[PDB]
Design an enzyme around this catalytic site. Sequence first.
Site, mmCIF file in Angstrom:
data_model
loop_
_atom_site.group_PDB
_atom_site.id
_atom_site.type_symbol
_atom_site.label_atom_id
_atom_site.label_comp_id
_atom_site.label_asym_id
_atom_site.label_seq_id
_atom_site.Cartn_x
_atom_site.Cartn_y
_atom_site.Cartn_z
ATOM 1 C CG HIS A 65 -1.702 1.278 1.425
ATOM 2 N ND1 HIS A 65 -2.682 1.751 0.573
ATOM 3 C CD2 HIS A 65 -1.619 2.177 2.438
ATOM 4 C CE1 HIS A 65 -3.167 2.885 1.049
ATOM 5 N NE2 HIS A 65 -2.536 3.171 2.176
ATOM 6 C CG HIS A 67 -0.044 5.587 4.754
ATOM 7 N ND1 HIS A 67 -0.786 4.920 5.700
ATOM 8 C CD2 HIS A 67 -0.220 6.912 4.992
ATOM 9 C CE1 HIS A 67 -1.358 5.799 6.502
ATOM 10 N NE2 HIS A 67 -1.033 7.019 6.092
ATOM 11 C CG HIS A 110 2.322 0.152 5.184
ATOM 12 N ND1 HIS A 110 1.187 -0.633 5.253
ATOM 13 C CD2 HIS A 110 1.895 1.439 5.239
ATOM 14 C CE1 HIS A 110 0.123 0.147 5.365
ATOM 15 N NE2 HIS A 110 0.523 1.407 5.354
ATOM 16 C CG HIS A 112 -2.594 -2.667 3.742
ATOM 17 N ND1 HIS A 112 -3.555 -3.287 4.505
ATOM 18 C CD2 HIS A 112 -2.760 -1.333 3.945
ATOM 19 C CE1 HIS A 112 -4.272 -2.375 5.142
ATOM 20 N NE2 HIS A 112 -3.814 -1.183 4.819
ATOM 21 C CG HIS A 397 -7.459 2.827 19.187
ATOM 22 N ND1 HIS A 397 -6.889 1.573 19.166
ATOM 23 C CD2 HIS A 397 -8.256 2.865 20.284
ATOM 24 C CE1 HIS A 397 -7.328 0.877 20.202
ATOM 25 N NE2 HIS A 397 -8.148 1.642 20.902
ATOM 26 C CG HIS A 400 -4.841 5.545 7.077
ATOM 27 N ND1 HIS A 400 -4.611 6.778 6.499
ATOM 28 C CD2 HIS A 400 -4.592 4.629 6.111
ATOM 29 C CE1 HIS A 400 -4.245 6.614 5.236
ATOM 30 N NE2 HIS A 400 -4.224 5.320 4.976
ATOM 31 C CG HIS A 402 -6.675 2.685 2.557
ATOM 32 N ND1 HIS A 402 -6.019 1.667 1.905
ATOM 33 C CD2 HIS A 402 -6.384 2.535 3.871
ATOM 34 C CE1 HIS A 402 -5.336 0.950 2.780
ATOM 35 N NE2 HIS A 402 -5.538 1.457 3.982
ATOM 36 C CG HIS A 452 -6.875 0.168 8.729
ATOM 37 N ND1 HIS A 452 -5.606 0.306 9.248
ATOM 38 C CD2 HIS A 452 -6.763 0.370 7.394
ATOM 39 C CE1 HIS A 452 -4.759 0.578 8.271
ATOM 40 N NE2 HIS A 452 -5.432 0.613 7.130
ATOM 41 C CB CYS A 453 -6.842 0.891 14.551
ATOM 42 S SG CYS A 453 -5.605 1.385 15.766
ATOM 43 C CG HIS A 454 -1.689 2.797 10.279
ATOM 44 N ND1 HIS A 454 -0.591 1.966 10.189
ATOM 45 C CD2 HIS A 454 -1.949 3.214 9.017
ATOM 46 C CE1 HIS A 454 -0.188 1.902 8.932
ATOM 47 N NE2 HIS A 454 -0.992 2.650 8.200
ATOM 48 C CB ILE A 455 -2.286 -0.174 16.692
ATOM 49 C CG1 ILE A 455 -1.756 1.116 17.324
ATOM 50 C CG2 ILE A 455 -1.611 -1.387 17.409
ATOM 51 C CD1 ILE A 455 -2.520 1.565 18.601
ATOM 52 C CG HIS A 458 -5.043 -2.380 18.089
ATOM 53 N ND1 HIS A 458 -4.969 -1.134 18.672
ATOM 54 C CD2 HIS A 458 -4.471 -3.238 18.965
ATOM 55 C CE1 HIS A 458 -4.392 -1.235 19.857
ATOM 56 N NE2 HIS A 458 -4.078 -2.502 20.058
ATOM 57 C CG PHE A 463 -10.061 -1.321 15.775
ATOM 58 C CD1 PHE A 463 -11.441 -1.225 15.913
ATOM 59 C CD2 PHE A 463 -9.250 -0.542 16.609
ATOM 60 C CE1 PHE A 463 -12.011 -0.335 16.850
ATOM 61 C CE2 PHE A 463 -9.796 0.347 17.550
ATOM 62 C CZ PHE A 463 -11.174 0.449 17.682
#
Length: 495
Positions: A65, A67, A110, A112, A397, A400, A402, A452-455, A458, A463
């Site tokens: 992805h 980002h 990164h 994905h 949290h 993000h 897209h 989604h949460c970028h952790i 998670h 998430f």
Amino acid sequence: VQIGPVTDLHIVNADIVPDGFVRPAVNAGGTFPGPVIAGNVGDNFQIVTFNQLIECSMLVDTSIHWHGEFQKGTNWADGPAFITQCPIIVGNSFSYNFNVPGMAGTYWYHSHLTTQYCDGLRGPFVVYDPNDPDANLYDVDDDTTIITLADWYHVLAKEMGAGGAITADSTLIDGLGRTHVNVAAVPLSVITVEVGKRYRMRLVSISCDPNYDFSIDGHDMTIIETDGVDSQELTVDEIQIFAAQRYSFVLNANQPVGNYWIRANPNSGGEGFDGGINSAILRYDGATTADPVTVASTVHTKCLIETDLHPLSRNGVPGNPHQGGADCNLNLSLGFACGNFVINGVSFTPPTVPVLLQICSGANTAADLLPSGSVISLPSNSTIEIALPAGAAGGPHPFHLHGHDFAVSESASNSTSNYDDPIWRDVVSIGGVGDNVTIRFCTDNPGPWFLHCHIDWHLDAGFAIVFAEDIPNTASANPVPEAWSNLCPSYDSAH
Ligand SMILES: *[C@@H]1O[C@H](CO)[C@@H](O[C@@H]2O[C@H](CO)[C@@H](O)[C@H](O)[C@H]2NC(C)=O)[C@H](O)[C@H]1NC(C)=O
Ligand SMILES: [Cu+2]
Ligand SMILES: [Cu+2]
Ligand SMILES: [Cu+2]
Ligand SMILES: [Cu+2]
């Protein structure tokens, strides 16, 4: 090193020891972090990704992805597994071919698929603006002034359990750092400056999890860009940067020739800076080659507060100046329970057929789309508002979206909304219990967009949801190349 906009990018396994502990990794372009991918605004990016992965331990499938790149017309090139594509299988390649109209600034790329970017597939992405309105504020902007902050784990991502609190074993700044436990005197990264020069520092969180308190001893930082959005000048002495966020800041090298600690304290893992954890070196040309002996300010007196940021452009805010002042206003119920995160009661678990292929095959509505309850349709040319009230297990949290950036109408730790001039970004912390962080955007980009949460731990624990934006126009707007059609049949055959 910088490559692009037209380049090969090979995905290989390599053992690396950024903190002295050798372990396996998944590398893009053979380095950690991956090479900087770069171009100018309006460029055609053609990135041929050769998957040469062999180590199952970290999965030999991959998907990348870009980002913060909107991918308008090219939803097929976005990267999230089972949302916009099946993973590329080992031994095959795939050309992410796309344009970046309108967009400039500091981004990243990164894996994905699952939690694979943790295992090392992460790197900077920079779109240079030959007419950057911030240009006159600095002397030097190049590969030597990119700063990545990364969490690094001694435990393989696939074996992290999950979740299940999870913590890093060191902080790496430009890919070097020391282990939090049983700290070995391993090499630190150095960032060199020259008395009297101003630097555009491009601070990139490539974190799978922690947020960092980022500072430079003896020095100020003047923020000029946030997640790709040009900002008015904001001088701070500390920056809390959450996973996947970016800032450009001006560093005026105005201190005496010497060595100054660069500090990035994660919110979990090792606390402090003993033996040079959470540290890198600011070195002035003419300084002795030695460890800094500097100290942070006891109290930082002008740390970044998100609400002080304002776009440089007249972005404003879409819709009406009150909560609900949008065409399609949403309020998501973000939960955690029994090791899984939910959005409106549903935990995301990747569908067998990617969302986009489902649409391409004739699905018309969110009801038609799998996974059930994990998709929300958005109508075209509509002002969307998304409230994201926090409280769900840790926290804070960074959400993000897209295919879009967005006005942060309401930031963390502050219940006053801003419908005049809030900063626009692409990843925002939703703060803490009782906050009601709120974002707004316009649907001008047909395609299924991940929220989604970028952790990353998670994300793997569910998430996330897909905004299927303008389902009816999706096929027309996003013609796919045959190589994309070929992905799912290969992957499915292989598995
Ligand atoms: C945070 O913000 C949203 C508004 O964007 C609030 O939503 C309201 O919530 C109540 C009950 O949940 C509904 O009756 C209203 O219709 C919603 N107002 C709308 C959508 O304009 C939400 O309650 C707030 N959450 C908090 C403060 O945790
Ligand atoms: Cu991302
Ligand atoms: Cu993204
Ligand atoms: Cu999270
Ligand atoms: Cu994402």
